[PDB]
Structures are given as structure tokens and as C-alpha cells.
Design a protein around this ligand. Structure first.
Ligand SMILES: *C(=O)[C@@H](NC(=O)/C(=N\OC)c1csc(N)n1)[C@H]1N=C(C(=O)O)C(=C)CS1
Ligand SMILES: *C(=O)[C@H](NC(=O)/C(=N\OC)c1csc(N)n1)[C@@H]1N=C(C(=O)O)C(=C)CS1
Lengths: 631, 631
């Protein structure tokens, strides 16, 4: 049942052509819950003239009230205090007897008279909780809330076809008031995923200005409403309603002699997402719990927290996040930062390095070498769980259990053809190893786009790596190149997939149009495409995941405190990263579950925690979310 | 120039198919100078293992040295120490007499022994290596990255089509050596744009692992050489040539009874770039001296310096950046930084912010309200650049002249609805004004991608703006949202072009696959597509131009370097602010040449100057290039 809003009427000669918008297709979750739908809405606006008074507007506002209801609480204290002085000038004067007298002294200007008039107001605020009053104030404030020639929205609410028929003319009679029918996205899960859904351009907006070339080259008219961010933008091609076009031929007189249909119109196609709306809501809830499930232990300048959850075998996405500006602890939605923002993630990249170190014949599978502080001409890398002494024979799994920097430092040196000896100079051209290393990490999704079906993905900050070898070893340890939370997810995921990097997607399937049927027959499956397989043997592969188990299933394994065991076995790796806000830390967690046939994977990023890490426990987020899913 | 080289030989029951490989298209500057050519090359390769006593492996390397000459660039210090030890067990054991005993005493083990030896060998004795030794070694090191049964590369040697035969001998007569003929790229301007040009994959690697599906989805076999970095990857469709494909019918005895040719092959299409290389080579030269010209004044870890030069009509005429360490000398090529990297940029954003003012009628075309060291709440928190000088009267065009970083601050509030009053509250929701401002910036390129024809362009780090209006004011003054040098360039250039944002492109023209070396018939022209106009009006853009015109032709920043020289240049300056270690500062520069009929636009970015006060003539590099271009 495709709807009909007149969008564009052009007169040529005796021809008049008419275009009607039709509803876009819906966005639904992996189970069919409507996430984005459509609503027919009337929009009533005021357009305040050059010389239009306050008595002018309060009057229109009054007639406007006996005609539509408003929601109160946009009203401020000042709105009410001003409205009161506006409504009760006789009553208000009496409180300012001295000041009205000293207004004509010249003792005071109005600008300080008006401020004491506001100071003496209280029980008279209730003198207009006469809800009839607040209604008028509701409308009136918007009529004063804006630019002169610009029209101003007063109400955009659901309207029927007959409703608009009865009231539009009698709204339009009032000076400044216009009405229009509009298509508007409606969002049952309110604020959930809204960033990811993106918006469609307003009727005021054409095609958005900076997007002209973009939409004009694909055939649009500048008047067309289009998707302009994220999901509405990304799947504009399928979500869009192909508009109705009619060409009328006319008499001289105006009489339509003939009519032809250029396009009857097509209600947009419905898009299903990989997202389980419930899981989504739960994760946002757990993330808000966990963020101060520290009561700010110290973390009151943690400024971002990120979570991505995914099916590591088909790249389905079930995942969101949000930031924390704790000049408060008052959070916003940083939904998209999961694949649009770049963070130093530190030690959680260590599995990729070993893989890099395997395929270049730099270390071998099971390699057992020893570790201890390192010494160069100045430069002094101690790993940080023994910096001074205590020299331990350690293999590649164990190095991941402990998250031992010096093992990764030693492999890095071996990858440079320059194995460690105390007092060696740092190899001065590290171009070649750095390249071998990066291509290693690139294979599991680190430093390359994941390919996700959404706009604005970043691959991370990638600075020259030629003759600062310290940055080279930083890289082997996650303290040079910045990565993305989605990249981290793609990376564990390929480990759990026995080496298959898969292109993540929040797109699930594409169906055909209906106004009713919350199915709609299938048109397109959106597949999690295999991108490549790691250049490594199963044994090389298995070793990283054996290591990953015993960082979560073993004891000094740096993920026991959060993952020790829970309702299903979980393998992973973690990360603490030095950065400068003033000095602070980044905390990172990646994992997957269950070990024997994985079905979930996730990445976690907390930014700018104050913490040295024998105190902080963020991947309890990981533990809690994984419990919910599997039970 | 011309030819085919054997790539693939396939049997199926007396029917052999032979695929020969062809040269790629050339890359040229705007006037037709050859940047990237092809050369026909001999790939000498070592593949031995299992009988590796390594002493014979050196013997092969010794043998090989009598046949080939080697560039010695790649020899590391370690290479030399290991080799020196092997060459003089005599000399080394004479330095290890204390440690000799300890090994036999039992107190020390062989690994420690070898480790101590390595520290005792200094560079003075490394000089005892002969030029011929350093030739054997150069070969040797390549053959000791050697996995037992896996071929490593020794030399790529420009040998003719008809002397390959004479020398092809060295095949299982020196053991591991395999020889083969491959098409390789040639660079007659050395390293001068190498990153931008990019790389094509080795005949060994075929399609690189990370790129597998990307190229397999295009019908490539996995054995195909492909474009893997930058321009090589970007214009792969045009640059690659069509293979020569032969088909023969043998009988049982191998005798060719028929043959057919399916494709004779042809060199790939020639790519003409918009770059002028003399112009390109000058900027690098100029850019070089200009960072030395801050070696003096303290730029200790200024670690980045970038320049982008262009105009509307065709192209990126120029693009160089480098990066530095520790002023330790070391520059390393970072041209790709101009569009891939994200830098806090400062006041140069003001031109666009002043237009976001016009669009939302927060300002008028000429507007005069004045500057105060202005404060709000907390008990201290306030504003800009001098604390007392309550300065007056400024035009907006006067505001960019001074770079009045307070007129902007006022403008923001006046766009967020509530102009300044001394002692005012913060707005607590700044979503809407942040959005309009950001919109405004995207219009002139700031905050979206430019649309350049290279991979990995970043649009800058863009964090949530809702409820920290501390950050929202920074955005007015280029201190919340990082852009790229290219983004600045498209932006300044949008002003030069009277409000018309153009999509930069480095490709000028694609030419038909020609077999014989003159650049062939025009196949495609790569255009500077107008993405959009600002919905800022005729007179409103002209002010921003005048504003620009008057901080270059008097006001006091921009005079200190653009003190009218060769040039009616108009432009704008930016000083930023970075606490990423310790309070450094970013220094940025935009501007455009001959103001009447503008022919050149430029953008500059210096990162991490330790030096705040507005004294450094870093924008001289800017003034310099215009002298060249306008002769
Ligand atoms: C533009 O962004 C302005 N930058 C600053 O004022 C610096 N931080 O600003 C938030 C400030 C300058 S030095 C000190 N260390 N931080 C400058 N814009 C122009 C200019 O030409 O760059 C000048 C008016 C100086 S202010
Ligand atoms: C990985 O990079 C971890 N290293 C660190 O966390 C320290 N910086 O490393 C360069 C960090 C400790 S706190 C101080 N601010 N710097 C290693 N991996 C794990 C981990 O989960 O982070 C730990 C064993 C610490 S070391």
C-alpha cells in the first residue's frame, strides 16, 4: 500500500509534471523486529515576519493551541517566568515599585531591571500550571525560537489522511502557519542503534549540499530526500522508494485533457540486519553497568568505551558502544566509533605478531627462548612483570599467557635478521622487517579495512617505519599503529575460524516491499565473504588459540580475573597501552566462545583509564555478555 | 619497451596452453615525461637447503660473485659481524681468551660466548672487510634468509633479450641458482614519488594474500602479478596489459601439429598524471631547506612536514611530505601523509566557520561585534589570546586578518542560539549547532573525504559533539576535529573557485594501449568534478576572499611570510596546540595564487613545533613555490 506525498510540481507549457514521494523500506533485526519504519506526519511551522510583535505571536499561539496539543517539558524556568510577566504585567509591576521609579531615574538600565524581576518569582509559577497556559507557552516558545525569514517547526506528529483534510486550511489561515504532509522515519527502540541507522535528508534539505555530485550522478533531483548517514546512506539503493511520476497535459483553461504515468512508484525494499535487537540492548546495558562498575575506582577520565560482538564464522554483527565525557560521567552514544575511531591497543595484537613471525621463518612453532631485560646503547626494554631480574625459559603459548613483551621483542629482532645480544645497536633500517610484520598483521585484519557494509571505516594510523626501530618493536607489541575495535573483532574471529578472515556485515538479507507483511520474500542474502586465509599452517594457527585458551583458562594468564571460567569456555587475549591524555592508559580485550566450535567473538576498548594493571577489570563486560548469549 | 615473457604452461592430453606476460602501461607527468616505465629483467634466485653446511652455501655465493655485481645497500652491521667472525676465527678468538676459559671452566655456555663476541666486534674491524668480501656477503645474506626448499631472490639484472642465454648457464652448475625473465618497473626520477606510484606484486607472490578476494572477484588467477600499493593498485584496470595466449596441439611425441593464437597481447594503457615533476622536485627541495631552516629555532621533534599544491582545472600538480625523527637528521618519505593522515590544524578552519555563520544566519555578511577576554562559569574558565586588551570594532573580514579566535567563539554561541553575556552558562546540549557547523565545514571539504583517486584517504577523527560544548568551541577554532593536508587544499581551493568545491584527482588522462612508444590515442579524461557549491552566496564568499586577501596583504598573521612577494596571493594561517607528550604546537598554512584569475592553491602542515609565539617563517615554503610557478 504505497503512500502518496506530492513532492514536486513543474509547469512547462500545457504540460504539468507531478512527483510523489513513497515510503522507504523498513530496517529490521535478525529476527524481524521492526527497527525503522515510516510514519505519515503533518508538519506545522511558523514563519515570523520582519516586523512581527510579541503580542502578535502570543495571539496566533493562542488560536494555535485550540487546534493541536503540545508536549510540555521543553519549557524552561525562564520560559515560564517570561510568560508570566507577559501574562501578568499588572501583577509583576507591583513587585518592582522602586525599580520602575529608578528606571526613569536612569539609576538602572532595563538589562538589570529585567534580572530582579526574574529573581522575585515562585508560587506564581503555578498560577499557570493551568495546563491551558503551558500549552500556549509550548507553541509560543518555538515561534520565537529561530531565524526571521525561516519557517519554524512547532509540531511534527502522526496524521491521518482525513485529519490533514479537516485542519490544514484552518491552520494555514493563521498568519505564519503552513502545513505539509511528510514521510518520517519512526524508531520503536527509541535511542537504540540510532547512530548506526543514520538519517534521511529533511524535506527542507534537498539532496544534502555536500552530497550533490554523489546523488545527482546517480539520477536524483536536488529535491529528493535521500539517506545521508550510515545505514540509510549505505543501503539507499535498496531502502529508497522509487517515486510516483505523472505528466498531465492541459487546456489553456487549466483542464487536464490527458495524463500519462512515467512511474507508478515503488515502496522501498526492506533490509534485515544481523543485529539481535535484544542482545544489542543488553550489551548497551552491560556497558553502562561496567563503565562505572568501578564507581570511578580511578577511571573518571576514561573518555571512550567500545564493544563489538560478532559471529566469527559468518561475520554477522551484533555490536555497539558509547563514550564518557567525565567532566560528569554523563555519557553519549559513540555507536559508530567501533569502526570509525583509531586507538592504540597494545598487547592484544600479540597473536598476529607470532603469525607474522611464523610465516617469515623468524621463529618456529613451539619456540622456547628465554627472556629478561633487554639492553642497547641507551634504550632499555624491560617487560613489565619482571624488569630487573628473574630470567625465565618461555614458549610461544606462555608468552601469550603472560603477555610477555620481550618474547615479541625477540621475535621482532629475529624477523629483522638481527637476533638479540646485550648491548647491540638497534638495527638502523627496519623498512623490510616492518613490512613483513605489517603484512602479517594485515592478514588477520590489523591495519587494513575490515570491509564492513557501512561508510567511514578507517584502517588506522600508519606512520613511516624505516629508521626508528623502537617504533618497530612498539609495533610488535601494539604501541605504534592505531587499530579499530572492529579490526580487533575481525582479528580474533579469524583465529577462531582456523585462519579465515571474513568480511563483517550488519546487513543480513534483503526482501521485497510490503506495507503489511513483516516477512516479504527474499531478494538478496548478504554474505560474510571470505577475504583470505592467513599464510600459516593449522599447527601454527592452533598454537595462537592454544595460547589464547591459556590466557583465559590458566592462572597467571592475564585474563583469569575476568574470564577464569564461565558458562562456556572462552579463549582470548588482553592489552594495556601507554598513551598521553597527561599520562593515562588504554585497556583492551579480545576473545571468542566456545573453544570447540566458536559462535561468538568480541573486542573491547576502554580509552584513557588511569591504571597500572594490577588494578582494573574491564573485560568482566566480556564475561557478562558471553554468559547472557549462551545460556 | 616491447616483448612477452613466459608465465604459464598448461597441459591437457596433447593440448598445451602457454600464457605470456606483457608490460604495464607507463605513468607520466602532465607534459608527458616518463615517471614509471618497464624494463626487461633477469631474476637470479637461490634455492638450496638440506645439504647446507653453510660453508658450501658461502662457496655458491663466492662463485656467483664472479658472475654478478651487487649494490651493497642492504648489508646490515650484523651481516658484517657474522661474516667477519667467519672470515677471521683467527682474529676473533684472540679477543675471547677470558671467555674461552670460562666455557671450558664450565662457568659460561656457547650462547653467552657468541653473545659476548658480538659485543666486542666494533665497526673499526668491520672495516677490515674487503670490497669483494662485501660483494660475496651481499649475495650471501640473501641466500641465508633461505628456508631449505624455498627460493630466495639474489639479483634483478638488466640483461638483454639476447644475452640472457649466454648467462642462463648458472643453473644446477652453481647449485641452488634458478634464473628467469620478468617484467619490472623502472624509475627515471629515482625515489621521487615512489609511495604515490605504488608497487606491483612479485612474480613470486602473484596476488598478495591480503588482496585475494579483491582480485579474484575480478577474474584474476592467483598467479597474476597485480597492482598492490597506491596508483599501481588504483589504476590497475588501465595500467595492466592483456596477456598473450597461445594454444598448441602436440602428438604423443611432443611435435606441434597445429597452433592458434587467442590473444597476441598488448602493453597496458598509458597513465598521464596531473603532477608536474619539475614542480614536484622543487617542492621537495624547498621543503627540505625549510625544515633545516627550523633546525636552528628549536623544531626538535617536529616530526612531520607536508605540502599539497593544486588548482580547479586539472589536478594535483604537486604532493610532497616527509617526516622526521629527533632532528637526528633523518627525513623519510611521507608523501602519502597528505591524504592518509590526521592532523589538528588550528585557525585555517575559520573561512568555512564564517560561512556556516552566514548559512544559519548567525552572522550577517558584514558584522562587527567585539572581542573580550570572555568568561562563563566554574570560577575562572575563560578565553582568548590576550588577557586585558578588550579590543573592538572588528569586521568579519577583519577577523580573519587578525585571525580573531574569539569572533569565531561568539559566532558559535550566536549559532547555538544564545549569544555571549559575561557570566553565562554553557549550553548543555550542543548537538544541533555542532551538526550545522560540521555541515558547514563539509561543504568546503573539511570533514568529508575530498574524493581523490588514491586508496586510504581518511576524513579525519570526528568525535561526538552533544554535551561537551568545551569541545564545541574548539571546533570553531580548529582544535577538536582533525583534517588532512589534502582536505585543507580542497577547502582553500573551494574559496579560490568562488564557492565551488572540486574533487581532486592526480590522474590527468588515460591513453589507448599502443604498441610503439609514443603516448597513444586518448581513451579517457579524468575530470575535476564540481562536488558542490557552498550555499553561501555571491557576496558572502567574496568576504572570505577579502578576509583571505587582507591577512596576506597586511594584517598582523600571514604578513611575516606572505608579505606580497611575487604574488597577489590570498590565504589563511593556523596555529594549533598539542599535549601528546608535552605542550608542542602545530603550524598550518593555506592560501591561493594570483587572486584575480586564481591558478594555484596550496596547503601546508608542520607538526609538533615546540615553539608557540607567532614567529616562525614556516610559510616561506609557501611563498617560495609561487615564485617558481609564476616565474
Ligand atoms: C588559531 O587556531 C589560533 N591558535 C591559538 O590561539 C593556539 N591555541 O588555540 C586554541 C594558541 C597560539 S600559541 C599557543 N601556544 N596556543 C591562532 N591563529 C593565528 C594564526 O595565524 O595562527 C594567530 C592569531 C595566533 S592564534
Ligand atoms: C602490552 O603492551 C602490555 N604492556 C603494558 O601494558 C605496559 N606498556 O607496555 C608497552 C603498560 C603496563 S602499565 C604502564 N602504563 N605501561 C603487556 N601485556 C599485559 C596486558 O594485559 O597489558 C600485561 C602483562 C602488562 S604487559
Amino acid at each position: 500500500a504505497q503512500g502518496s506525498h506530492y513532492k514536486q510540481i513543474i509547469k512547462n507549457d500545457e504540460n504539468i509534471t507531478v512527483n510523489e514521494s513513497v515510503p522507504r523500506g523498513r530496517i529490521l533485526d535478525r529476527n524481524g523486529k521492526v527497527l525503522v519504519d515510516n510514519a505519515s506526519k503533518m508538519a506545522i511551522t511558523y514563519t515570523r515576519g520582519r516586523k512581527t510583535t510579541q503580542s502578535e505571536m502570543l495571539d496566533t499561539a493562542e488560536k494555535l493551541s485550540k487546534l493541536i496539543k503540545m508536549d510540555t517539558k521543553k519549557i524552561t524556568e525562564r520560559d515560564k517566568k517570561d510568560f508570566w510577566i507577559q501574562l501578568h504585567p499588572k501583577k509583576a509591576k507591583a513587585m518592582m515599585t522602586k525599580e520602575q521609579a529608578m528606571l526613569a531615574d536612569g539609576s538602572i538600565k532595563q538589562d538589570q531591571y529585567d534580572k530582579q524581576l526574574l529573581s522575585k518569582i515562585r508560587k506564581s509559577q503555578l498560577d499557570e500550571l493551568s495546563s491551558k497556559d503551558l500549552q500556549v507557552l509550548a507553541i509560543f516558545r518555538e515561534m520565537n525560537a529561530g531565524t526571521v525569514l525561516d519557517p519554524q517547526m512547532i509540531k511534527n506528529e502522526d496524521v491521518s489522511e482525513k485529519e490533514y483534510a479537516a485542519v490544514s486550511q484552518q491552520l494555514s489561515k493563521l498568519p505564519g502557519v503552513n502545513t505539509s504532509m511528510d514521510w518520517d522515519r519512526k524508531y520503536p527502540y527509541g535511542d537504540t542503534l540510532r547512530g548506526i541507522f543514520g538519517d534521511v535528508s529533511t524535506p527542507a534539505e534537498g539532496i544534502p549540499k555536500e552530497l550533490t555530485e554523489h546523488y545527482l550522478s546517480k539520477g536524483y533531483s536536488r529535491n529528493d530526500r535521500v539517506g545521508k548517514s550510515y545505514l540509510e546512506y549505505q543501503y539507499e539503493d535498496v531502502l529508497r522508494g522509487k517515486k510516483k511520476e505523472m505528466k498531465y497535459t492541459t487546456d489553456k483553461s487549466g483542464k487536464v485533457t490527458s495524463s500519462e504515468v512515467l512511474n507508478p512508484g515503488a515502496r522501498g525494499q526492506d533490509l534485515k540486519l544481523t543485529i539481535d535487537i535484544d542482545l544489542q540492548k543488553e550489551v548497551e546495558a552491560l556497558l553502562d553497568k561496567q563503565i562505572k562498575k568501578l564507581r570511578s575506582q580511578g577511571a573518571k577520565d576514561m573518555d571512550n568505551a567500545m564493544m563489538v560482538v560478532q559471529n566469527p564464522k559468518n561475520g554477522d554483527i551484533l555490536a555497539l558502544a558509547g563514550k564518557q565525557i567525565n567532566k560528569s560521567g554523563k555519557m553519549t552514544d559513540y555507536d559508530i566509533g567501533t569502526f570509525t575511531s583509531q586507538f592504540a591497543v597494545g598487547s592484544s595484537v600479540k597473536g598476529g605478531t607470532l603469525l607474522a613471525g611464523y610465516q617469515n621463518k623468524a621463529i618456529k612453532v613451539g619456540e622456547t627462548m628465554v627472556d629478561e631485560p633487554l639492553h642497547f646503547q641507551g634504550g632499555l626494554t624491560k617487560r613489565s612483570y619482571f624488569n630487573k631480574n628473574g630470567h625465565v625459559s618461555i614458549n610461544d603459548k606462555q608468552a601469550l599467557m603472560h603477555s610477555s613483551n620481550v618474547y615479541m621483542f625477540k621475535t621482532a629482532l629475529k624477523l629483522a635478521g638481527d637476533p638479540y645480544y646485550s648491548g647491540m645497536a638497534l638495527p638502523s633500517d627496519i623498512s623490510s622487517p616492518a613490512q613483513k610484520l605489517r603484512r602479517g598483521l594485515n592478514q588477520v585484519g590489523l591495519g587494513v579495512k575490515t570491509g564492513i557494509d557501512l561508510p567511514n571505516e578507517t584502517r588506522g594510523q600508519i606512520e613511516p617505519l624505516t629508521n626508528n626501530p623502537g617504533n618497530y618493536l612498539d609495533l610488535s607489541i601494539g604501541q605504534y599503529d592505531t587499530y579499530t575495535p572492529l579490526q580487533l573483532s575481525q582479528y580474533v574471529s579469524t583465529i577462531a575460524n582456523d585462519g579465515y578472515r571474513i568480511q563483517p556485515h550488519i546487513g543480513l538479507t534483503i526482501h521485497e516491499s510490503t506495507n503489511k507483511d513483516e516477512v516479504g520474500p527474499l531478494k538478496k542474502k548478504i554474505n560474510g565473504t571470505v577475504l583470505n586465509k592467513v599464510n600459516n599452517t593449522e599447527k601454527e594457527i592452533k598454537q595462537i588459540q592454544e595460547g589464547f585458551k591459556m590466557a583465559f583458562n590458566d592462572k597467571d594468564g592475564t585474563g583469569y580475573v575476568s574470564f577464569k571460567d564461565t558458562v562456556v569456555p572462552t579463549a582470548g587475549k588482553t592489552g594495556t597501552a601507554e598513551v598521553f591524555q597527561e599520562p593515562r592508559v588504554n585497556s583492551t580485550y579480545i576473545g571468542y566462545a566456545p573453544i570447540d566450535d566458536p559462535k561468538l567473538a568480541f573486542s573491547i576498548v576502554y580509552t584513557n583509564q588511569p591504571v597500572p594493571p594490577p588494578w582494573l577489570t574491564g573485560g568482566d563486560l566480556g564475561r557478562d555478555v558471553i554468559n547472557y548469549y549462551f545460556k
